[PDB]
Design a protein around this nucleic acid. Sequence first.
DNA 1: TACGCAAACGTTTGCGT
DNA 2: TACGCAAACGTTTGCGT
Lengths: 338, 338
Amino acid sequence: TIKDVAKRANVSTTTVSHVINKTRFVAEETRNAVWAAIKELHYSPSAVARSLKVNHTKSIGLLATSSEAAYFAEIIEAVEKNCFQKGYTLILGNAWNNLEKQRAYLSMMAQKRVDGLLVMCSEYPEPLLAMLEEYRHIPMVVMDWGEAKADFTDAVIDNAFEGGYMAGRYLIERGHREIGVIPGPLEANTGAGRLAGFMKAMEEAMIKVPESWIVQGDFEPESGYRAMQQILSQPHRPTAVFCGGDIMAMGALCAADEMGLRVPQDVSLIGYDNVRNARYFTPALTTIHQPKDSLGETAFNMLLDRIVNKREEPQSIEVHPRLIERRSVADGPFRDYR
Amino acid sequence: TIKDVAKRANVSTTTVSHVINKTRFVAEETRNAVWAAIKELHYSPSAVARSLKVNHTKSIGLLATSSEAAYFAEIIEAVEKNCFQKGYTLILGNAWNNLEKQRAYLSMMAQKRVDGLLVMCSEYPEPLLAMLEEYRHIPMVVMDWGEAKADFTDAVIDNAFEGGYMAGRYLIERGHREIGVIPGPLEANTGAGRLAGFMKAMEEAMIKVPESWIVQGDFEPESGYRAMQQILSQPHRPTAVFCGGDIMAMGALCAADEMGLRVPQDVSLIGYDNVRNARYFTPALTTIHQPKDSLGETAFNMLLDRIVNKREEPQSIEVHPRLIERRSVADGPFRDYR
DNA sequence: TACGCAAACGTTTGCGT
DNA sequence: TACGCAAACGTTTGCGT
Ligand code: HPA
Ligand code: HPA
């Protein structure tokens, strides 16, 4: 069909291609005629043919974990903006943490010959790390590791530990000493990482978290709901709670309400993520904000680089969480004594 | 590189291709050898070359409006599941209701030669309807119209009007007669449509909504926040409020709380969407549930059809909203008098 | 029986002159 | 000066025998 254009215009397809890609000078008259044809014939140049020759699809693949989750969703929307503005096409894939699913999308991606790969898999077992390597040839950056798990990738690091520390510190500085924590999956960075940053500040303050006070979450609201319940549903209960993620926090808020508990008047709650609509939680959620937009743009850029300026070496860029005071925390019994 | 495989195996590329696509019988010995090579050589068949010949990319394009929004997000995650399970690849595009952006993604999509198009643009001006037609050749279904705006597409219809009616009815049947409403954009179906279904039930009950009681939203939480405020911030206020979408409702809940109003004890609130985590709103949100999963699977199917069984005629399938009682509504002053 | 030769898909780009 | 011819990208598939 580029042939059909060339002939309506009575010029070579070489000509047609040059005017289309402005790749060499062409007589106006000529140029015009081509456009003419191009339009009446209703021509849509085929990218598949082009990619076949030029060797790049100008398309990028995001191998995510899930895209419904608030947290994830915001990131993804970020990456897409960046692809759109630099002409890239985004292929979205959710692996639900399923190896098989992961092996599958990864392969459905290489064949489609994506220019680069964006990896956000939450948990990284050696078997997954292993698969990942089999595609070192395809440029890629993992956007969710704590440290640099591997050498065949680029990495953007969130400083999830420094975030945990911040959260704890805040609680301490507000007068709290009986604190509880609902962490996210330990196999994940935003999980383990945040928790440990938190425990460190405790250790520092000689606070001790009684194990009956720490309950595993899964980032889902129901997990939060169940944990808070289990926490407040006991003889002795903390006065403040650190919840590993906002959406779980949202769940924690609902249960308290349901036990007729008052936030922050009966329990103080601090979360983590600062998801777009946490300010509209009831009450407005105090939390640690994760730079989602930057986490995305930053990732897109390292990739474009490697893609364009053919980098070979592994890079890593840090990003920084920051505390956001809203209205879900209140002074604790020791506020006056410091 | 299929050539490199054929030679490590000392067979024709024709052979290689046949064993790869199991498209004709091949000697085990032969088959094996090919696999052998296939593996040592680390071969990834190129889809771009294949599509070039077979004439289909086995990839579908979703021209959405935005993907962060809860509502949208859930739908999208649904479509992707369906693509994944039937071997399709999903290209996600957000046009933010921007014509230019829409013209762009639409074109960046045809060229990439997607097998079919999934359209979810919220608002459809003639200029957009017009662009859409220019691609009638590419199979596509719009998943968000009220009626069948055009004839060159397939349509899944949500019965957003019947939903509005349901909401109103409920309020009426609970004793309410002083009701207010925060609708979504009138230029959109889930906006106009829901509102009108609602007004009809009012008209039926001879209830009259004083214009000081209806405030436009935009589906975003802040819009909700502002509207509720404007509503309760007045001499005379309704006892129940119908909010066009859950996330806006979430916003409406926060403001009431902030004016020290009690839900549902001071104001009753009913929303619409039944977004995955509305049950964890405080209080648990009573709402109209939109079948998001079905809305998605249903759309994917009409498309696959047209794509596969080469349909030519426009189809339309209806889907149905249903009421979900949670805890944000309470009996009104007229409950006892019916 | 089990497999090859060679043309074709729709482009881009090197040399020409 | 301003433009064409023809090979190549990596496959699939019709006929062969
Ligand atoms: O894995 C996660 N899921 C949801 N929210 C999150 N916030 C941090 N990590 C996550
Ligand atoms: O356009 C919309 N946006 C967000 N939520 C919605 N629920 C119905 N329509 C919409």
